[PDB]
Structure 1
Amino acid sequence: PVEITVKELLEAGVHFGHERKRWNPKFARYIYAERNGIHIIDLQKTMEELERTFRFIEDLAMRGGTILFVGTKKQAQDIVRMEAERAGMPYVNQRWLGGMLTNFKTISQRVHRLEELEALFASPEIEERPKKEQVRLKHELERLQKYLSGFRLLKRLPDAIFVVDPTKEAIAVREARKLFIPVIALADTDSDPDLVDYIIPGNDDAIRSIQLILSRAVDLIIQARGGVVEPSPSYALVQEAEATETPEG
């Protein structure tokens, strides 16, 4: 049953039958206290820390600060970009690079090739040598973009970090704290609530939680201070958040 949330998209489900001899284990469902992914233990402990954290995201915001989020799991990545562009800041989906922060003065160079290439495919210099290098410059521009598509907003090392799972993207969190950078992350029982600077004890995994915690973390920024504007947002045309703007091919 899809409570107006599922939407009938002619989803067959012919190959989706439970004929997968799934009728094999009785204890198949070892079930615990994790049936939908919404845990809040001790409350007087977590809610205390939340206010804490979210009070800073607000501060770093107003102080003009910057917050690059760090995403690495498939269980996020894209969920990192939406909350990325919606909130004008740098993000890292694909993969971290040793030094992303403890080497700026060098990884930032890559960012430069990137921009450099991005210039050339805009001037008449297009096509002046063998297709080979033409592609030699396309591979790069392409790759570079794959791994640097979000680091282009880091003219200088950031005031904070928002890594999802400070245990899977630990290098990130190492590099960070080695440079006195408050590290903000999700974290759970299977994490280092000692390393995480400003914790938000959500579910490390679980798409939903992510989008839930990461969004307000994005909205809180945006709503930093305020203003009038009371005609509210429109529904169906929420494309500026990114969605799937203009395709190529």
Structure 2
Amino acid sequence: VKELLEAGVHFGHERKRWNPKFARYIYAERNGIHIIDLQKTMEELERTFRFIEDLAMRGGTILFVGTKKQAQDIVRMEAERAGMPYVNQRWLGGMLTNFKTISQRVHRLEELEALFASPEIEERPKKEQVRLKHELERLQKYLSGFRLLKRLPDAIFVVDPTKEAIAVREARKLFIPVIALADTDSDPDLVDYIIPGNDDAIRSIQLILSRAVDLIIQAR
């Protein structure tokens, strides 16, 4: 503790939303809000960091999945400040279970960006140029970061396991361990290595991701 407490980590959601399965991480109720027991957070954080460091030193890759409004920038910066791929714009149905199909899209994106830097575009009247440019824009919007996956990742990092339940489900299907910064309204069962904390309040997200990325960098 003493790092998380001032970061607003132990501030959850209202009593309208909390999940019964998550009661094992709830400390007490104040002013009609749920307070996450920061001690249990500490042991869980220790365990998950041990797992992360072991995986990193093994040479595995982690896929970061944060598709909230606020977590986008932080996830992008943290993944970019590592070799780890990331998805922050939108999770397309079948990024993992249908990895083969999306690999085709990745190849299309790379060949397109290569093509626009080539002297054979003097043909192809400018309307086709516009169409291809728009296609490239869409691809680089969605498939950025996802390009760094040469194959299925060894783990996954989800910010909100409920906002991104689809990614969690897919990770379950393929026996990929799930690491999540779960909160009050989350299901602990679908997450193997769980950090009980706040998934809102940018401060907390930044703190956790920064610490994790530092541990990953150190463990290379």
Structure 1 CA distance for aligned equivalents of residues 52 and 205 of structure 2: 16
Higher relative contact order (CA 8 A, sep 6+): 2
Q: Which moved more, 1:188-197 or 1:15-24?
A: 15-24
- Residues 125, 16 of structure 1: alpha-carbon distance in 2 compared, 3 angstrom cutoff: farther
What is the CA-CA distance between 1:196 and the residue it aligns to? 1.2
Q: 1:9 to 1:60 in 2, by over 3 A?
A: closer
CA contact under 8 A between 1:71 and 1:77: conserved in structure 2?
yes
Alignment match, 2:5 = 10
Where 2:27 maps in the other structure, the secondary structure is coil
Does the CA contact (< 8 Å) of 1:77 and 1:94 recur in 2? yes
8 Å contact from structure 1 (residues 66, 159) kept in 2: yes
For 2:132, which of 137, 155, 162 is the aligned residue? 137
> d(CA) in 1 for partners of 2:31 and 2:25?
14
How far the C-alpha of 1:189 sits from its partner, in A, is: 1.3
Closer, same or farther: CA 37–213 of 1 in aligned 2, 3 Å: farther
C-alpha distance in 1 between matches for 2:50 and 2:84: 19
Name structure 1 gaps, 5 residues minimum.
1-5, 226-249
Structure 1 residues 184 and 8 mapped into 2: Cα distance closer, same or farther (>3 Å)?
closer
CA drift at 1:134: 0.5
Q: Partners in 1 of 2:210 and 2:35 — Cα distance?
A: 18
Answer 1 or 2: which has greater helix percent.
Answer: 2
Shift of 1:12: 27
Change over 3 Å in CA distance of 1:138–1:173 after alignment to 2: same
119-128 or 163-172: bigger deviation: 119-128
Q: Which moved more, 1:142-151 or 1:25-34?
A: 25-34
Secondary structure of residue in 1 paired with 2:199: coil
Cα distance, 1:37 vs structure 2: 14
The answer to whether the 8 Å contact 1:92/1:150 transfers is yes
- What is the aligned counterpart of 1:98 among 93, 97, 120? 93
**Could you say if the C-alpha distance between residues 82 and 37 of structure 1 is closer, same or farther in structure 2, counting changes exceeding 3 Å?**
farther
How high is the TM-score relative to the length of structure 2? 0.83
How many Å apart are 1:39 and its aligned residue?
8.4
Q: 1:39 to 1:152 in 2, by over 3 A?
A: farther
Tell me the equivalent position of 2:182: 187
Alignment partners' CA distance in 1, 2:26 and 2:44: 29
Cα RMSD over matched residues?
Answer: 8.5
The more displaced of 78-87 and 13-22 is 13-22
Consecutive unaligned residues in structure 2, runs of 5 or more = none
Matched-pair contact (CA < 8 Å) for 1:70–1:92: yes
Q: Percent identity?
A: 100
Q: Show structure 1 runs of 4+ deviating over 6 A.
A: 6-40
The separation in 1 between residues aligned to 2:214 and 2:28, in whole angstroms, is 30
State which drifts further: 122-131 or 166-175: 122-131
8 A Cα contact 2:8 2:203, kept in partner: no
Distance 1:121 1:158 in 2: 30
| Alpha carbons of structure 1 residues 145 and 33: separation in structure 2 relative to 1, 3 Å | farther
Partners of 1:10 and 1:205 in 2: CA distance: 14
Distance 1:189 1:168 in 2: 13
Find the structure with the greater CA-based Rg. 1
CA contact (8 A) 1:37 1:206 kept: no
Is the 8 Å Cα contact of residues 39 and 202 (structure 1) preserved in structure 2? no
Query: 1:35: Cα distance to partner?
Result: 10
Distance 2:12 2:51 in 1: 48
Q: How many residues align?
A: 220
Which secondary structure does the structure 2 equivalent of 1:161 belong to? strand
